[PDB]
Each structure stands twice: as structure tokens, then as C-alpha cells.
Design a protein around this motif. Sequence first.
Motif, PDB file in Angstrom:
ATOM      1  N   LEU A  43       0.859  -1.178   0.000  1.00  0.00           N
ATOM      2  CA  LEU A  43       0.000   0.000   0.000  1.00  0.00           C
ATOM      3  C   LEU A  43       0.903   1.239   0.000  1.00  0.00           C
ATOM      4  O   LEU A  43       1.778   1.394   0.840  1.00  0.00           O
ATOM      5  N   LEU A  44       0.645   2.157  -0.925  1.00  0.00           N
ATOM      6  CA  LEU A  44       1.505   3.349  -0.955  1.00  0.00           C
ATOM      7  C   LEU A  44       0.701   4.525  -1.500  1.00  0.00           C
ATOM      8  O   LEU A  44      -0.372   4.357  -2.062  1.00  0.00           O
ATOM      9  N   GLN A  45       1.289   5.698  -1.314  1.00  0.00           N
ATOM     10  CA  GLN A  45       0.765   6.928  -1.872  1.00  0.00           C
ATOM     11  C   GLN A  45       1.703   7.382  -2.991  1.00  0.00           C
ATOM     12  O   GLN A  45       2.919   7.187  -2.909  1.00  0.00           O
ATOM     13  N   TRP A  63       1.856  10.897  -5.880  1.00  0.00           N
ATOM     14  CA  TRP A  63       1.242  12.091  -6.426  1.00  0.00           C
ATOM     15  C   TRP A  63       1.011  11.884  -7.920  1.00  0.00           C
ATOM     16  O   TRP A  63       1.959  11.671  -8.650  1.00  0.00           O
ATOM     17  N   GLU A  64      -0.258  11.935  -8.331  1.00  0.00           N
ATOM     18  CA  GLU A  64      -0.666  11.798  -9.728  1.00  0.00           C
ATOM     19  C   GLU A  64      -1.821  12.743 -10.054  1.00  0.00           C
ATOM     20  O   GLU A  64      -2.866  12.657  -9.410  1.00  0.00           O
ATOM     21  N   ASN A  65      -1.619  13.568 -11.087  1.00  0.00           N
ATOM     22  CA  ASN A  65      -2.615  14.523 -11.577  1.00  0.00           C
ATOM     23  C   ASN A  65      -3.098  15.458 -10.457  1.00  0.00           C
ATOM     24  O   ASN A  65      -4.284  15.474 -10.114  1.00  0.00           O
ATOM     25  N   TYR A  93      13.642  -0.557  11.195  1.00  0.00           N
ATOM     26  CA  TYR A  93      13.989  -0.088   9.874  1.00  0.00           C
ATOM     27  C   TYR A  93      14.017  -1.224   8.846  1.00  0.00           C
ATOM     28  O   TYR A  93      14.189  -2.401   9.171  1.00  0.00           O
ATOM     29  N   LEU A  94      13.804  -0.843   7.583  1.00  0.00           N
ATOM     30  CA  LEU A  94      13.955  -1.766   6.470  1.00  0.00           C
ATOM     31  C   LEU A  94      14.535  -0.950   5.309  1.00  0.00           C
ATOM     32  O   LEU A  94      13.956   0.061   4.961  1.00  0.00           O
ATOM     33  N   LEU A  95      15.596  -1.445   4.687  1.00  0.00           N
ATOM     34  CA  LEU A  95      16.200  -0.800   3.509  1.00  0.00           C
ATOM     35  C   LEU A  95      15.867  -1.644   2.298  1.00  0.00           C
ATOM     36  O   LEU A  95      16.092  -2.845   2.367  1.00  0.00           O
TER      37      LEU A  95
HETATM   38  C1  LIG Z   1      10.016  -4.529   1.055  1.00  0.00           C
HETATM   39  C2  LIG Z   1       9.454  -3.219   0.647  1.00  0.00           C
HETATM   40  C3  LIG Z   1       9.149  -3.057  -0.783  1.00  0.00           C
HETATM   41  C4  LIG Z   1       8.513  -1.814  -1.238  1.00  0.00           C
HETATM   42  C5  LIG Z   1       8.460  -1.658  -2.701  1.00  0.00           C
HETATM   43  C6  LIG Z   1       7.736  -0.530  -3.325  1.00  0.00           C
HETATM   44  C7  LIG Z   1       7.558  -0.586  -4.801  1.00  0.00           C
HETATM   45  C8  LIG Z   1       6.894   0.539  -5.516  1.00  0.00           C
HETATM   46  C9  LIG Z   1       6.805   0.500  -6.997  1.00  0.00           C
HETATM   47  C10 LIG Z   1       6.463   1.724  -7.772  1.00  0.00           C
HETATM   48  C11 LIG Z   1       5.346   1.676  -8.764  1.00  0.00           C
HETATM   49  C12 LIG Z   1       4.832   2.973  -9.311  1.00  0.00           C
HETATM   50  C13 LIG Z   1       3.368   3.186  -9.563  1.00  0.00           C
HETATM   51  O1  LIG Z   1       2.469   2.681  -8.836  1.00  0.00           O
HETATM   52  O2  LIG Z   1       3.004   3.921 -10.517  1.00  0.00           O
END
Ligand SMILES: CCCCCCCCCCCCC(=O)O
Length: 162
Positions: free
Chosen positions: A57-59, A61-63, A102-104
Motif C-alpha cells: 500500500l503506498l501513496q 502524487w498523480e494529476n 527499519y527496512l532498507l
Molecule cells: C520490502 C518493501 C518493498 C517496497 C516496494 C515498493 C515498490 C513501488 C513501486 C512503484 C510503482 C509505481 C506506480 O504505482 O506507478
Amino acid sequence: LIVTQTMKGLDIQKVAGTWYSLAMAASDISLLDAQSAPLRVYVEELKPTPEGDLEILLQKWENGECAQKKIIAEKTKIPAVFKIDALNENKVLVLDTDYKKYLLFCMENSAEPEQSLACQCLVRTPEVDDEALEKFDKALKALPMHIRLSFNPTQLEEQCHI
Ligand SMILES: CCCCCCCCCCCCC(=O)O
């Protein structure tokens, strides 16, 4: 194969839950420069499946707005490496984590040849973790990064780190 630091003995189930994208770095300025840049993405939550795939799950910025997104990273034969299904194959590598702070991770373009790379330092809380950022910077010192961003706690609590 540009990134050659992976987490040995990764337990993907243990990365479940809330994360914050404290810092991000990329091989090319244009990948992170603008707020609508393609790899400028803010992690919200990791949701490992029973089969060992990774839902993200992520955010982004688009349009002219901060839009939510759900991504699936499929597992490979290497526990620390996942593949996102897209037009061109994109590998996610987990470099290092302690699960609890943390996680890299990096994500890279399979073929360019030179190829694009974006890495992030994730942390569990909206705090500046100097030790995690040191491990992030040490992990990247070899890698050919040309943009680095980091966020403050106020930003970390806002949608798209506004
Ligand atoms: C273990 C953590 C992994 C996190 C990975 C994140 C990947 C994001 C990919 C970007 C895709 C771009 C988009 O939705 O347009």
C-alpha cells in the motif's frame, strides 16, 4: 544486477504492518525530482500473503493529487528479491531490516543496460532514525545515486509527505 546487498535469512511475514519512507535516493535525478516523479512513492503498509508474495500500500502524487495505490510484488526463489508485474520487469530487493525499526530496499530496472535504481529507508515510526539513515547511506555509498531526499516527522504524518 546492480544491487549486491541482500538480507540473509529474511522472514517476509515479519515485515508486515506500518512503515514510513524516511529517506529515498535514486540513480537519476528525474526519478525523484518532481512530486509526480515516477518513483516518488510513499510506503504506507506491507501486507505479506500466506504464499509469501508482498502486497504494498503506498501513496503517489498523480494529476495534482495524492493518490493511493496497491502493488503486488511476487516472490522469487531468492527470499530477499521480489518482482513487480509491469511493462518491463522491476525487481525489489530487501537489503536489510530488523523488522522492529527499519527496512532498507531498492528497486531496479532489469535491463537498460545502465538501468535505473531507487532505494528507500523505511522506518516503523514518524521519527528521524539517525542510525537507520546511517545504514541507508552506507548501503548506498557504492551505488551511483544522484538524488537523495529525507523527510521530517511533520511531513511523515501527511499524505504524500506534503
Ligand atoms: C520490502 C518493501 C518493498 C517496497 C516496494 C515498493 C515498490 C513501488 C513501486 C512503484 C510503482 C509505481 C506506480 O504505482 O506507478
